[PDB]
Specification:
The complex is a heterodimer of chains A (209) and B (212).
Chain A (H helix, E strand, L loop, with lengths): L4 E2 L3 E3 L5 E6 L10 E7 L3 E8 L6 E3 L7 E6 L4 E6 L8 E7 L11 E5 L8 E5 L3 E11 L5 E4 L9 E2 L3 E2 L5 E10 L9 E6 L4 E6 L3
Chain B lengths: L3 E4 L2 E4 L5 E7 L7 E5 L6 E5 L3 E2 L7 E6 L2 E6 L9 E6 L6 E2 L3 E5 L7 E5 L3 H4 L3 E11 L5 E6 L2 E2 L4 E5 L9 E10 H4 L4 E7 L7 E6 L3
Parallel strand pairs in B: 2-11
Antiparallel strand pairs in B: 1-3, 3-8, 4-5, 4-9, 5-6, 7-8, 9-10, 9-11, 12-13, 13-17, 14-15, 14-18, 16-17, 18-19
The chains are: A mainly beta (209), B mainly beta (212).
């Protein structure tokens, strides 16, 4: 219908390189130059550059000339953006966007994480005490993301699941908490469903005092 | 290259307000465009070439200005409009975007509920202790959280994390996490989280003594 689909998340080591893809649908691919932009935490939008799928011609932002090579593939209807010499500062969401006038149509973004860290499942620890709060500490994992649900999806109200922080160790950590009636404590079951896909780690943690 | 400073950086406003966001370029530019963005989405085009509305975009949005001074106005603020807004320059290379302006929901004071959590024994066995303070459902975001370890004010060894505004009541919730080695943790007795906020006339202190 005019929709750009990018490839999935990437997790790369410093010094390495990665090639992201953006497949187009809903128009004739060569009639519009394809741009790329990055959004780094503290979400600042910066334009990287474009390719013209017809000429093969490219224009780049100075800031990104050392970093990005943008190529296109006319047969497959996809544009590529290759990032080389990866360093932790390259950690960002990347978009492709159509080049007809202003960017009307965007891809859904690809998250790219650059880190010397290695895949590791989280340790999960209980957070334990009208109302009381409890939760789980989801600690020492890499990379993002993690999902936390409660009682296999039955509890949703009062659940806060905090954004992850990056420790000096290069490993993430987060808490997910929920409030509960205090008379239920020794008797009602509360379970953390923690899911860490990147390391295939699923743990169901029951929380009690 | 050409940069745009937006005004204001952050704005708290109520439904039905008149919102005026300024985009100040550093050198002469011909046209300005405005995007809107909500967490986890690619931005949407609202205004193209200084003052032209994009299809589907409500007529409560307007744009104006020339040279290096451009504005976006929301004449009557709606619930869908709470988001980030960026001005965009597309007439010199590199194409550049404004710093953004965050428009948040104004509502009334609400004191947080404070809870402190000692490290589990399970974590203790690994050699690291985490202590956690929770501030639940408060407004405004501004809040002071002082960790005290046998009355010694801690500075630099905790990390904070803050929910986005709650879609129903527009409150926030916050977790401050203190990290210590097992051996260091065992050197002290009283662990305290002290919360300062405007909805509290006095600061609230939650504590425990190491050893149940």
């Amino acid at each position: 219908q005019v929709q750009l689909v990018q490839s999935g998340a990437e997790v790369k080591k410093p010094g390495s390189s990665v090639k992201v893809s953006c497949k187009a649908s809903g128009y004739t691919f060569t009639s519009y130059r394809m741009h790329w932009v990055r959004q780094a935490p503290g979400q600042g939008l910066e334009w990287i550059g474009y390719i013209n799928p017809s000429t093969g011609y490219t224009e780049y932002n100075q800031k990104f000339k050392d970093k990005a090579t943008i190529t296109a593939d006319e047969s497959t209807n996809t544009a590529y953006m290759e990032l080389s010499s990866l360093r932790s500062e390259d950690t960002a969401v990347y978009y492709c966007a159509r080049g007809g006038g202003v960017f009307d149509y965007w891809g859904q973004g690809t998250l790219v994480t650059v880190s010397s860290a290695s895949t590791k499942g989280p340790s999960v620890f209980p957070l334990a005490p009208g109302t009381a709060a409890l939760g789980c500490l989801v600690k020492d994992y890499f990379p993002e993301p993690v999902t936390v649900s409660w009682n296999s999806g039955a509890l949703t109200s009062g659940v806060h699941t905090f954004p992850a922080v990056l420790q000096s160790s290069g490993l993430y950590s987060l808490s997910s908490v929920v409030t509960v009636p205090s008379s239920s404590l020794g008797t009602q079951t509360y379970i953390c469903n923690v899911n860490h896909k990147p390391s295939n780690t699923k743990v169901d943690k029951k929380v009690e005092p | 290259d050409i940069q745009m400073t937006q005004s204001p950086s952050t704005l708290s406003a109520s439904v039905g307000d008149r919102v005026t966001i300024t985009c100040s370029a550093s050198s002469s530019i011909s046209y300005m465009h405005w995007y809107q963005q909500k967490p986890g989405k690619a931005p949407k085009l609202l205004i193209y070439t200084t003052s032209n509305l994009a299809s589907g975009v409500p007529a409560r949005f307007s744009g104006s200005g020339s040279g290096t001074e451009f504005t976006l106005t929301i004449s009557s603020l709606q619930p869908d409009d709470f988001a980030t807004y960026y001005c965009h320059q597309r007439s010199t290379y590199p194409l550049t975007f404004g710093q953004g302006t965050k428009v948040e929901v104004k509502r009334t004071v609400a004191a947080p509920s404070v809870f402190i959590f000692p490290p589990s024994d399970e974590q203790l066995k690994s050699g690291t202790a985490s202590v956690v303070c929770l501030l639940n459902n408060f407004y405004p975001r501004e809040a002071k959280v002082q960790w005290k370890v046998d009355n010694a004010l801690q500075s630099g060894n905790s990390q904070e994390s803050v929910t986005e505004q709650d879609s129903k009541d527009s409150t926030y919730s916050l977790s401050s996490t203190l990290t210590l080695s097992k051996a260091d943790y065992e050197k002290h007795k009283v662990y305290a989280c002290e919360v300062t906020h405007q909805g509290l006339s006095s600061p609230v202190t939650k504590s425990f003594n190491r050893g149940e």
